[PDB]
Amino acid sequence: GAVLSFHNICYRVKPVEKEILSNINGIMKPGLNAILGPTGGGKSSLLDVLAARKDPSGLSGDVLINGAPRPANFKCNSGYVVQDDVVMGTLTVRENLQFSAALRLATTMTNHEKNERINRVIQELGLDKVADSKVGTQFIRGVSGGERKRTSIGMELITDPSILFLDEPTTGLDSSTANAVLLLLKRMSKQGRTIIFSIHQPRYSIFKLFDSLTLLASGRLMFHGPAQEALGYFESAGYHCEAYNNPADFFLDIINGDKPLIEKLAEIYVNSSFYKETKAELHQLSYTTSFCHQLRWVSKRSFKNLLGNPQASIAQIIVTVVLGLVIGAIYFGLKNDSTGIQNRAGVLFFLTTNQCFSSVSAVELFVVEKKLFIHEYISGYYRVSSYFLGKLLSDLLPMRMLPSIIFTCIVYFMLGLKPKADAFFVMMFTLMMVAYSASSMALAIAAGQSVVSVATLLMTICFVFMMIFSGLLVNLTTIASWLSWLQYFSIPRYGFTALQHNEFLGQNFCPGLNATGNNPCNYATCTGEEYLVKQGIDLSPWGLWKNHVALACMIVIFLTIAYLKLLFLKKY
Amino acid sequence: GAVLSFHNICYRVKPVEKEILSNINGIMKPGLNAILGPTGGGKSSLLDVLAARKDPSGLSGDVLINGAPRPANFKCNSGYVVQDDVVMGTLTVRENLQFSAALRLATTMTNHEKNERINRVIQELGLDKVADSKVGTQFIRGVSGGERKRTSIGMELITDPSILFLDEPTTGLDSSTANAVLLLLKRMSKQGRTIIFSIHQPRYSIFKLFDSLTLLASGRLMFHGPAQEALGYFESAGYHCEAYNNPADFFLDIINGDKPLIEKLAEIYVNSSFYKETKAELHQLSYTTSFCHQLRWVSKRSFKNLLGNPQASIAQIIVTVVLGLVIGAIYFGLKNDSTGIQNRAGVLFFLTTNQCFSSVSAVELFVVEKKLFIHEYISGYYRVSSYFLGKLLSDLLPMRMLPSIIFTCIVYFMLGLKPKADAFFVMMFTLMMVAYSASSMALAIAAGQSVVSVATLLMTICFVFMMIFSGLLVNLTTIASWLSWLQYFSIPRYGFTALQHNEFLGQNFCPGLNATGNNPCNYATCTGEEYLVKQGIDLSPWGLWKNHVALACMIVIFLTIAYLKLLFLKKY
Ligand SMILES: CCCCCCCCCCCC(=O)OC[C@H](COP(=O)(O)OCC[N+](C)(C)C)OC(=O)CCCCCCCCCCC
Ligand SMILES: CCCCCCCCCCCC(=O)OC[C@H](COP(=O)(O)OCC[N+](C)(C)C)OC(=O)CCCCCCCCCCC
Ligand SMILES: CC[C@@]1(O)C(=O)OCc2c1cc1n(c2=O)Cc2cc3c(CN(C)C)c(O)ccc3nc2-1
Ligand SMILES: Nc1ncnc2c1ncn2[C@@H]1O[C@H](COP(=O)(O)OP(=O)(O)OP(=O)(O)O)[C@@H](O)[C@H]1O
Ligand SMILES: Nc1ncnc2c1ncn2[C@@H]1O[C@H](COP(=O)(O)OP(=O)(O)OP(=O)(O)O)[C@@H](O)[C@H]1O
Ligand SMILES: CC(C)CCC[C@@H](C)[C@H]1CC[C@H]2[C@@H]3CC=C4C[C@@H](O)CC[C@]4(C)[C@H]3CC[C@]12C
Ligand SMILES: CC(C)CCC[C@@H](C)[C@H]1CC[C@H]2[C@@H]3CC=C4C[C@@H](O)CC[C@]4(C)[C@H]3CC[C@]12C
Ligand SMILES: CC(C)CCC[C@@H](C)[C@H]1CC[C@H]2[C@@H]3CC=C4C[C@@H](O)CC[C@]4(C)[C@H]3CC[C@]12C
Ligand SMILES: CC(C)CCC[C@@H](C)[C@H]1CC[C@H]2[C@@H]3CC=C4C[C@@H](O)CC[C@]4(C)[C@H]3CC[C@]12C
């Protein structure tokens, strides 16, 4: 079996440094081990500390498995259940179990066998009635909290872990289901699996199931040893219970007071035989799956989440179509007359801005998953690179490409723009590039930010500032010499400039050309080239492709920054 | 005392109609009355049904207080605690208690006395350590769940209610605090207060506190009567417990199975003496505070929430200032030259759009409170009109007015616009009006909508469509005769038109005027009046003020629509 141990553990949290956990020692031999205590004692903190999930800065003690230190593949053989559930709502139960099993369990086993285990676990936890039901979403009524909790438990139970940690496995579950869950854990722990869990308000039948007990309170350790001997240990010191029915309530009624009480009990413990014995024993003793597989399964999960979140995919497509048709009707039949310039520039500007501002929604779905991503990374699911590229090939690439195609296909021929294929495809390509660059910038800004409202604000502000330098609201030749340099950071500038260059080039907007020919007018701006020059634009085709290479470089740089912001993030 | 009763209750929920509650009967005499049952049984549903919070369409039975029907002032003397807490996070505990006491309790009592009661309740619930701490927020670490729950309880406990309903008063609380809470309830119920509550996993000491028991399961009623006699009732029929320690666990172990089991037990009950007796008894028996006070306290709460939510007030002000300065630097020194027209129109358009699009954030804070508003309305806090006007005088009026002032004060003199006071104040007034109209439209759209992402999408789309008709992106004289009518629904059109009219009117943009004077150029658009005409604008001052009256009418109409959308909302 696995004989976990610890000695002289202490912990600190930061400015001022608070000591959540003080001197703690104990041994957790195979079987069933529990951690009772009141709220705020330090239950969850200790549990994470034992499962290598707290920053090692505060930790100041030795955690040893079987005497030898922590194995490097430790996280590949231990499961951890979270106090607050982390389960993708837009998926079903079975999808999530398949995902966890697929990424964590080895791929030598056939898919039929993994599905077999999944069915077995569903039976064990009593989830047949909601096996295929969707977990909670803001649009669909969610499954009951108990079923969600059992799902979180199963996602880790399927891994066949030799060591298992649970933080409040039974919170909100009715008594019968909780009894079923714990009987299952006992049946499993009688095979060598070393289980460690916290719990609130057990019943006596449960309390007889224990094999080792730990009692945390205000950081300090009150008692550690066999479950049976705890009552007698207290009996000797005092509190002749003889009246309470459930020993757990009795144990807490002493912590809660029913010189300082905490210190008194803790010193009684350190003067107990149990602590001497455990100090004696302590002193005496002292990735699974390749890159491609991770990428594929992450991308599939994101496919499903995106299709199930119908405010960034379907709403976006529909509004794009409606806008395209409306624009087509409004600007219909563009004329080479006085009004031609205004309409043409306006439509191009609108398309550019809409592409730029349509990326906020997609990244926002990337922000919310932060916590989920951290939990899944620590647990040992996927690398960082895999998660990044997966979310890219699932969200950024597919959905952002379509709007440009639809917009151009509808608009170009209704309005009456340049009647050449080259211009058509150039317009489509340019819109794609601005869209991707905006999404990249949003990812860079919003990567590793917990809150969405702040990120949305920042991105919106940045886009506004970029828009002021587009080329239509202000003429860029009037910009002061000490601020024109800012115009090179503007995505809309490159997109709009490139769209204007390929449209106005072969155009003349003064209808009377013989009349215009004899005496041209100084302040007339008849032709497209003159307007182009006045806005400060080159005429050479290099003057067009320069914007595209700039956009590509921006894409590369911003994606790299996002990857690093994720990499040096605090995953603890 | 208060002798509640019910008879033949049934309930339905809708398309297909599901019957959540079947035949139910019982009496809840003064004292302590509990409602045990498993998840999904119908606990919360029954509790709401008894407290007049379910739509009366499904209800099909008689709820009688002391034989006489439900008094009209019933909600003025009964408190109701919610299963999921509804407590304003941005406030402290004491602020919330003051708010509830101020609006619900009468104003004859002095404020010192109300504060006295608040302190007493804080002592009763054990919240001295977190009395002034802020409740959970997305920026500040939140207080523990137990303290939040106790706060929700106190907000209703302070009312001195003759009848009190609780849905899971003790969920997540540690045993000691829960014991304290229930001992408090018992001490209070021994004075005539009739308490009715649900609960999960009581302990035996608690179970002895009961005076009446109700056992719901899958809608059906399993047992109703004195707490003591329940065990013997089962004993007679079966299940010779004699082994379980806590009777509550025993009672549920029979519902959960530890021809159909549910129907069998229910029929055993209807064949019991208890049901005969209660059927016999049933057959035998068968605003506080004015408008101004509500308005003031609602407005104060919104002051505090807005100042505590630093993403719609402080961020907005700061970004406004930064944008104003940047604009001032960019367009600095506008010249009456060829470029004058483009820069002038662009700056005006930008200000208009920014005012229009800056209203999404404020309304979004109005959306999230929907659920809270419904709960507070039903409980009997405030009228609808009060809540509306309060949120208006707190959020819409103050914050939306400032941006225009700041924008104009900074911009007008840096750029070099019309050097006349009249134009300055006209510009300020116009910006105010567009801002208010946009906020009104957002309120109309977002009133009575549960989700924020959908509302944000809708408002953004509407503003975009309005913007396409502003007057700059497209010339409105080229619009087809069968779509120009849509331009009269555009707020930015009125604002932008009014800003342009008072600026370009006294301007000439062709620098060589003697050169221009001898031979004017057809396609020249030198003066401001010509450009104004070409965009399709009247020159008479009525041609300016018409936009303002239109904006005012839009404001009035949209606010009225919002009020009605709230009024005919389903408050049940
Ligand atoms: C003048 C108008 C035209 C020019 C507009 C320029 C926009 C540039 C946008 C890209 C910047 C970027 O990508 O920011 C990248 C930075 C990089 O973060 P980090 O340093 O690696 O943090 C490391 C974190 N650790 C320690 C955990 C690793 O992300 C941020 O700081 C997030 C906030 C950025 C706000 C930027 C607002 C800029 C407003 C400019 C107003 C004049
Ligand atoms: C060219 C410039 C275009 C400008 C368009 C501006 C439209 C503004 C209308 C506001 C009406 C309003 O807000 O009314 C309020 C309505 C609902 O009202 P209700 O049914 O009474 O709900 C009360 C029901 N109760 C009483 C039972 C509770 O909200 C909405 O419908 C929100 C959807 C509006 C979508 C607008 C999309 C426009 C697309 C146009 C494509 C050509
Ligand atoms: C989508 C229309 C447009 O992109 C455009 O092409 O013209 C200009 C402009 C636009 C959108 C927005 N703004 C603008 O000035 C300001 C703005 C704020 C928005 C906010 C508030 N931000 C200031 C954080 C949102 O929450 C959601 C969408 C938002 N969209 C916009
Ligand atoms: N990262 C942290 N930053 C600040 N305070 C913390 C941090 N982690 C814990 N604490 C503080 O330590 C105290 C106890 O936290 P802890 O995680 O141990 O809860 P707990 O004892 O396990 O009870 P429960 O399971 O119900 O959450 C709390 O007051 C908490 O504020
Ligand atoms: N408005 C509703 N729409 C759809 N289903 C509903 C609605 N109200 C109740 N139900 C369903 O009726 C069943 C019983 O719901 P109920 O509210 O009574 O549970 P409960 O008594 O509150 O238990 P608990 O408080 O622990 O969650 C549930 O399956 C629930 O989904
Ligand atoms: C119908 C037209 C005229 C409306 C204009 C387009 C916008 C306002 C409409 C078009 C289709 C709509 C979507 C249609 C379907 C869904 C799925 C539903 O579970 C939530 C709302 C949501 C996401 C709608 C949001 C609003 C929406 C995007
Ligand atoms: C951290 C982020 C914002 C870095 C910003 C880097 C951007 C602005 C850099 C990356 C590559 C650069 C471009 C490289 C080459 C060209 C072609 C030249 O004939 C004009 C300048 C131009 C177009 C540069 C403009 C600035 C540019 C686009
Ligand atoms: C481009 C310029 C104008 C950006 C303006 C950003 C300023 C105005 C915004 C951006 C993010 C905002 C911060 C977001 C979160 C917090 C944490 C909170 O505990 C105090 C307020 C504080 C610190 C906000 C203050 C306002 C803030 C700093
Ligand atoms: C439910 C919502 C969309 C109501 C829409 C009502 C708006 C569009 C109505 C309300 C008041 C109306 C305005 C009242 C007076 C004038 C002045 C006149 O010289 C031109 C028309 C104009 C400007 C009207 C246009 C239409 C108008 C603005």
Author numbering:
A (entry chain A), B (entry chain B): 34 to 47, 58 to 301, 326 to 353, 369 to 654
Q: What does the primary publication say about this deposited structure?
A:
ABCG2 also functions as a multidrug transporter and exports a wide range of xenobiotics and pharmaceuticals, thus strongly impacting their pharmacokinetics. Here we present cryo-EM structures of ABCG2 under turnover conditions containing either the endogenous substrate estrone-3-sulfate or the exogenous substrate topotecan. We find two distinct conformational states in which both the transport substrates and ATP are bound.
In contrast, the turnover sample containing topotecan revealed two well-ordered structures, which we termed turnover-1 and turnover-2 states, resolved at 3.1 Å and 3.4 Å, respectively. Whereas the state turnover-1 features more widely separated NBDs and an accessible substrate cavity between the TMDs, turnover-2 features semi-closed NBDs and an almost fully occluded substrate cavity. In turnover-2, the topotecan density was narrower in the horizontal dimension and longer in the vertical dimension, probably reflecting a rotation of the drug compared to the turnover-1 state. In turnover-2, the gap is even smaller, causing the entrance to cavity 1 from within the membrane to be completely sealed and even the opening to the cytosol to be reduced. We now found that in turnover-2, Q181 and F182 facilitated contacts between TM1 of one ABCG2 monomer and TM5’ of the other, thus helping stabilize the TMD domain closure. In contrast, the R482 side chain is rotated towards the external side of the membrane in turnover-2, where the guanidinium group contacts side chains and main-chain atoms from TM2 and TM4 in the direct vicinity of F439 (right).
